[PDB]
Symmetry: C2
């Protein structure tokens, strides 16, 4: 392995995090009050993880990806039910991104960080999967 | 040594798996019929993971720790509600043991396996916590 593979996977995961946090704005807007705490949970988790990743990249001397002002969603939505499905998809995409950081991270500290993020993503997908 | 810590972590995780499979026998005997889909699921997941780790340790030139006849369970139990708490404690202990394998595993293949095991243990714990949360909470007055 390579520090170049490590950096690319972590930057890819940060780009995913940016997109997911944007996506949770639409999930929030569409979802009923009964899932407000789930949305707030997911947004806080993603924002904190994003911020931490920006710090990890800076320690590496890599300028972190920034968020786009706007994203094309990976599915069309018109429903609270659609919002749950979108949240499931984003958490699953986050898991795939974090699994690649576990594989390519050179240090144990960063591998353990990525494992935590992969595990939170998976747990979050299951929680929204119980919404639909 | 590095491979020394790797082997040690995976042996510990295997030992936790044996102890978990034993504990789910008790979870099952006590439980609700209402959660036997969950118990069956958890047991097949653990038995399969255990067998997988037995193979991995062999690939490394390590003869696997075999199961003990009995274990001391992580907590005392006496009814159907204690068993869901036991299941959460067992899954949480399994996450802890798998996070150690992620941390000390030298190969990407073994770290991916350990992270999958870690994530499954975490998803299992949340599922049992969802079971507890749907049952009456009856905390003793302090």
């Amino acid at each position: 392995s390579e520090g170049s593979a490590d950096n690319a996977a972590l930057c890819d995961a940060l780009a995913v995090e940016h997109a997911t946090i944007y996506g949770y704005g639409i999930v929030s807007a569409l979802s009923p009050p009964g899932v407000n705490f789930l949305v707030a949970d997911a947004l806080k988790q993603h924002r904190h993880r994003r911020d931490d990743v920006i710090v990890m990249l800076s320690a590496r001397g890599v300028t972190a990806p920034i968020a786009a002002a706007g994203y094309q969603l990976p599915m069309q939505v018109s429903s609270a039910a659609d919002a749950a499905r979108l949240a499931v998809r984003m958490e699953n995409d986050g898991a795939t991104a974090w699994r690649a950081v576990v594989e390519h991270a050179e240090t144990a500290d960063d591998r353990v960080f990525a494992s935590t993020a992969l595990t939170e993503s998976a747990v979050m997908a299951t929680r929204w999967n119980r919404v639909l």
